[PDB]
Amino acid sequence: RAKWRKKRMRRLKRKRRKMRQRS
Amino acid sequence: EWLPVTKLGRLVKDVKIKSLEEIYLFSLPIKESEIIDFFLGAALKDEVLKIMPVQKQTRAAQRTRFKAFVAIGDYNGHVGLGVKCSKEVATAIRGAIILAKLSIVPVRRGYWGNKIGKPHTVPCKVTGRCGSVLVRLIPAPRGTGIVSAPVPKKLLLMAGIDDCYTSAWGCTATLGNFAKATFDAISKTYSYLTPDLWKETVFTKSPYQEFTDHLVKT
């Protein structure tokens, strides 16, 4: 889809936020 | 032999109308392909611009068929742009040539600046446009020639437009369209109301009035 691809990205960012907050 | 199916045709056959400028004045529709060929027999010359094959999908493959573009002109004043879409190419072509001959139109060709000699360029900068394509003809000074793309060059020569700067935009690639546009340009030379015209029109009888007692053939 597109909506769901956007969701994907926003979750996937949400991980990258969380990994970089470890440092 | 020719047998005129029209009123005008019968007049022309009987050597009643002297030139096709007597027709163009009164803006009569020429429907006989022989009229034009009688007035501009020879001189008038034809060239196939392109054969494009256009094809409609049927349930059992496709009806591939042809479309021959033809321009025609007597390298002096007159040109036409014939398009006929038929099955076998020859039969397409043949019809297009006729369709051009029926189309043909006069060009008012003019001068660039210093008014001397015999007209050579387009009078005023006109355009003809067609389905995204837009063609501008511009008056250009003697010698220049036609500074133009091939397809416009081809007609513009055939018209009797010796010299002309042109520009163009849209999808000039679409040949038929691009010829159609540049044709409608030089058709619109005689449509532009310069001050050179301006003198109140006289009005003449018209062939159908002038030859009234003739047409009712005694």
Partner: protein
């Protein structure tokens, strides 16, 4: 808003002339408009217009005559420098044979050729043919 009076005056007189109107009204009027028209009237493009003195701003009614391909304007009123005036008239007028760029000079509002005679530069207004 109403910004370039001249501009909306010309435009209406051309929009008339397209649609075939015999005469045509124009709703602000000005020295500049008037002056322009007079130049067009000099060269046969329009008829004998006439102007309604409201105790205010103005109103012209121009007798048209179907002779006018297009009366147009150039904003901005660019300064032409005679040098350039040839270039202007080349890429703005439809020929070297008719048309008149009309530019406002020291001398007055006038076609390019009255300007070229007098050898006067000027600011452009508009054009017609």
């Amino acid at each position: 808003v109403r910004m370039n009076v001249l501009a909306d005056a010309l435009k209406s007189i051309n929009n008339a002339e397209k649609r075939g109107k015999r005469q045509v009204l124009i709703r602000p009027c000005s020295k500049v408009i008037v002056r322009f028209l007079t130049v067009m009237m000099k060269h046969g493009y329009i008829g004998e217009f006439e102007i309604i003195d409201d105790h205010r701003a103005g109103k012209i009614v121009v007798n048209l005559t179907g002779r006018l391909n297009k009366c147009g304007v150039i904003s901005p009123r660019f300064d032409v420098q005679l040098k350039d005036l040839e270039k202007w008239q080349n890429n703005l007028l439809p020929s070297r044979q008719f048309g008149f760029i009309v530019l406002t000079t020291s001398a007055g509002i006038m076609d390019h050729e009255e300007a070229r005679r007098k050898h006067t530069g000027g600011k452009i207004l508009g054009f017609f043919f």
